TrEMBL record, chains A, B:
Transmembrane segments: none annotated. Homodimer. Pfam families: Pyr_redox_2. One of its GO terms (molecular function) is thioredoxin-disulfide reductase (NADPH) activity. Binds 1 FAD per subunit. One of its GO terms (cellular component) is cytoplasm. This is Thioredoxin reductase. It comes from Mycolicibacterium smegmatis (strain ATCC 700084 / mc(2)155). Residues 3-291 form the FAD/NAD(P)-binding domain. Keywords: Disulfide bond, FAD, Flavoprotein, NADP, Oxidoreductase, Redox-active center. One of its GO terms (biological process) is removal of superoxide radicals. The lineage of its organism: Bacteria, Bacillati, Actinomycetota, Actinomycetes, Mycobacteriales. It is an enzyme of class 1 (oxidoreductase).
Length: 305, 305
């Protein structure tokens, strides 16, 4: 059995691709992962996804997406793809000890937001801990919050957040910043931002919601506690391109490269969508749009064969 | 009063831009038009917009979008922009006898699908008359339908539709096709497609739904009726770039050009989203994604000023 298309991933990109591919009668085979449903499965309210005047929880939205794909005939498998062979007319994916083949493959594996890896970070996610100022910054009006990170990301998150927060404490483990000079001086100029260099978070405290962070000086080991009600983690993003490295061309940070304003990768018959590709917008709606484009690309490419 | 941003247009691009801009506290001023709500306001069921497992009508979806934008503080005006001055630090839009100014402008004016302009075409829209095989082709399984047009669009629509339709009659007013050779021969090879050259539709018949088309030979004037239950119009798209022609760079078909994979146009402070830009995918979800990108571009550009 060689399927028309296999989709790898189950966030907004993968499900929107599945919906279009299934409605186009391509009978898409979709490997969702055991941690299925993408990044929104790990948040609370999604308010900026257009179509929901009163908002919707992340898992609610993602299950609508999933049931929609099922209704049009997508074959969904809650399993991880462990290896792929993407070159040539017949592509193979390996899932444990099982193999599946297709003429076209849509890569929708997303990007992981780097975690601090400290106690309290996972439990207080959506309860004071966030990875996205555009997404959740709204909810921290007149509060004291922290932003963790030393790059342009952290700089942009911290400066953006000062239009809501009472104060923003920007925490970085070194005394040097990898942020561009312009981004670093914008934050320095902002009166609502205080810099804590040579500082790491060791724990996030909070009884149902974030109430404070425990800090450590990375040079002296001095520790203290900071009273805050928000923690924005901006220590970077890792595109999940490990499966396809050495097969599809990646950029220097691991993102899958695509041709022009399409989803075509460097390999014939292989298309890529979502935050696996986009290091600029990183929203559910942009990921959803690009998964629709990937499926239209694939259908058009399949018709050419 | 100089606003931070003005949005021109009220389809999925404009409303998604409004939602993001309003949630970012930019207080966007949005000119929706008197024919507000974009192309979906003129369809029935929207089934491929991810997030709705049982589908949603076009006007239902668009009003969710509109109320969502209002809830975050967008200032919506149901009025046409009649002229713009987009160059320089302060941009102006003219609405009848009123003027409004902003530091940033997001162009979201969409594209008009060319109409046949015949009796019955508007009344039977969403009732047998369609402009989008990807959108509505699903609903014509085992029926006899027509596709009107002579380009790659019509070719692609006609060939795609044969996976649903019993038969597809492809109607064109000349005996020559502007479609590329590959697209024209794909349709010629398809056994479910019959070509009617030198033929125009003069009227679409239908008591609540399409039941037939009246035809005329454009050379001899011979007329006849064809029994069909679907009419797909694929005579082209016209981007609504008339406002900005001579100010923003357009491509040879009138679409607004943007830089790379962003929404930046050729003019500082001017961004463009949706089907005004995209001549490739033309879906609500892709338009919605690109209006989110336009607002993120604008916010980042405003912060740089
Ligand atoms: C906490 C949080 C809150 C957010 N809130 C918002 C918000 O309110 N609004 C908004 O617009 N955006 C929000 N985002 C961002 C948004 O969720 C992402 O931009 C979007 O989900 C990206 O979609 P994607 O499909 O490219 O990838 P992802 O969402 O990462 O989905 C990819 C999926 O594919 C699976 N997958 C990966 N590799 C494999 C494999 N080998 N085999 C099988 N499956 C695999 C993954 O496990 C994952 O389930 C939030 C993100 C986070 C982390
Ligand atoms: C009949 C039909 C059915 C469709 N069905 C589907 C479907 O099921 N699924 C799908 O994904 N897509 C569907 N589409 C396509 C989808 O609607 C479009 O791709 C999408 O709406 C494009 O959004 P946009 O915001 O770029 O522009 P548009 O939707 O065209 O919206 C632009 C809006 O801005 C307004 N505007 C323009 N100029 C001005 C001005 N000067 N001043 C003020 N306002 C102005 C316009 O009047 C319009 O209301 C359908 C299209 C049609 C025509
Ligand atoms: O950097 C990490 C973990 N990591 C994940 C991938 C690579 N590193 N954590 C961290 C924790 C507290 C802090 O203040 C700064 C950073
Ligand atoms: O071309 C048009 C109208 N038009 C709109 C913009 C430019 N032309 N109509 C048409 C009607 C029947 C037919 O068979 C083919 C075409
Ligand atoms: Mg996930
Ligand atoms: Mg309209």
């Amino acid at each position: 059995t060689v399927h028309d298309v296999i989709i790898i991933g189950s966030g907004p990109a993968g499900y929107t691709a599945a919906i279009y591919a299934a409605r186009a009668q391509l009978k898409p085979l979709v490997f969702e992962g055991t941690q299925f449903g993408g990044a929104l499965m790990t948040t609370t309210e999604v308010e900026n996804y257009p179509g929901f005047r009163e908002g919707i929880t992340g898992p609610e939205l993602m299950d609508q997406m999933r049931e929609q794909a099922l209704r049009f005939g997508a074959d969904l498998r809650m399993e991880d793809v462990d290896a792929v062979q993407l070159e040539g007319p017949v592509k193979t994916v390996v899932v444990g000890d099982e193999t599946h083949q297709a003429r076209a493959v849509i890569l929708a594996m997303g990007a992981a937001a780097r975690h601090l890896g400290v106690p309290g970070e996972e439990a207080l996610t959506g309860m004071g801990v966030s990875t996205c100022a555009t997404c959740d910054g709204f909810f921290f009006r007149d509060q004291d919050i922290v932003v963790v990170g030393g790059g342009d990301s952290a700089m942009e998150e911290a400066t953006f957040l000062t239009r809501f927060a009472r104060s923003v404490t920007l925490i970085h483990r070194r005394d040097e910043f990898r942020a561009s000079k312009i981004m670093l001086e914008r934050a320095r100029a902002n009166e609502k931002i205080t810099f804590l260099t040579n500082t790491e978070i060791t724990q996030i405290e909070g009884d149902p919601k974030v109430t404070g962070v425990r800090l450590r000086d990375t040079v002296t080991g001095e520790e203290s506690k900071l009273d805050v009600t928000g923690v924005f983690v901006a220590i970077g993003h890792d595109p999940r391109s490990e499966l396809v490295r050495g097969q599809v061309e990646l950029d220097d940070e691991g993102y899958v490269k695509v041709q022009g304003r399409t989803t075509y990768t460097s390999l014939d018959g292989v298309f890529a969508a979502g935050d696996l590709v986009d290091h600029t917008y990183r929203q559910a709606i942009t990921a959803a749009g690009s998964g629709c484009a990937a499926s239209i690309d694939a259908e058009r490419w399949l018709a050419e064969q």
